[PDB]
Amino acid sequence: MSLTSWFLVSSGGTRHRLPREMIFVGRDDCELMLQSRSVDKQHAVINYDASTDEHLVKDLGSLNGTFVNDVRIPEQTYITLKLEDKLRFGYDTNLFTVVQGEMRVPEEALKHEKFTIQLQLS
Numbered sequence: 548m549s550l551t552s553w554f555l556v557s558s559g560g561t562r563h564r565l566p567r568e569m570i571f572v573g574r575d576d577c578e579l580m581l582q583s584r585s586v587d588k589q590h591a592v593i594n595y596d597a598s599t600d601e602h603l604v605k606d607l608g609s610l611n612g613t614f615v616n617d618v619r620i621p622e623q624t625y626i627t628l629k630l631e632d633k634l635r636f637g638y639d640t641n642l643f644t645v646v647q648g649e650m651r652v653p654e655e656a657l658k659h660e661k662f663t664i665q666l667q668l669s
Contacts, residue, residue, distance in 0.1 A: 550650050553647050583638065601628065632645040
């Protein structure tokens with residue numbers, strides 16, 4: 548099949564699918580892992596608003612902050628991510644671009660009952 552989703556595209560060349568649920572961003576035991584010392588162990592969350600089909604970033608109270616279009620966002624405040632926004636956590640070298648697109652669901656993933664049901668209900 549083909550899935551429609553928001554993604555983060557790193558300046559480092561990687562692509563990261565934003566799921567329709569909350570994820571953590573950080574240096575330690577997070578869904579989106581970064582390696583920089585300038586990023587907190589649990590730095591931010593990227594949540595999803597099902598009503599507006601948008602993602603929102605919240606800095607959890609990190610040492611160096613979270614930047615949207617080079618602006619340090621207020622801490623513990625949800626900021627809506629818009630198409631072409633430039634997102635950086637702390638002073639990590641990954642500059643992420645907020646994009647939306649169609650991705651290919653591998654045929655192997657459709658053998659998973661729970662995944663397929665959540666895909667069909669999407």
